[PDB]
Symmetry: C3
Subunit: 56 residues, 3 copies
């Protein structure tokens, strides 16, 4: 356009929009990993609970 | 204003500011979940340590 | 510059670029913690597997 500054800003904003959307995906993807960890930990403790009344 | 392009950029920047602030909350919230997982895992291993000198 | 609005937008975009880059670091840093949790959980369950054929 007739304004180089505006053109650069527009480009940077488009890039930011994408970077933000990507970080959103990254965060959401990490959620499944956190739940996986949390679930495996509960699984370990559950197993221990299942034998704690038998072994001390 | 007299510049439609600037108005659109301003709006997009305001939205980005909010989206970034939100992602910040999401990340911080996930921290408590990660620590919860990490703590429950250590708890399982601690329990195992407490009986490992008794059972092999 | 001759446009206060553009100057403010430019500043805000620079700040956003930094905030986004930082969130990227925060997310990446959290990854090592999630893996740590996941690994310690697997470690607990592995230990349990190692004695499950001996104790029920």
């Amino acid at each position: 356009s007739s304004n180089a500054k505006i053109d650069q800003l527009s480009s940077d904003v488009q890039t930011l929009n994408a970077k933000v959307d990507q970080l959103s995906n990254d965060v959401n993807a990490m959620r499944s990993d956190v739940q996986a960890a949390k679930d495996d930990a509960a699984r370990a403790n559950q197993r221990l609970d299942n034998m704690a009344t038998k072994y001390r």
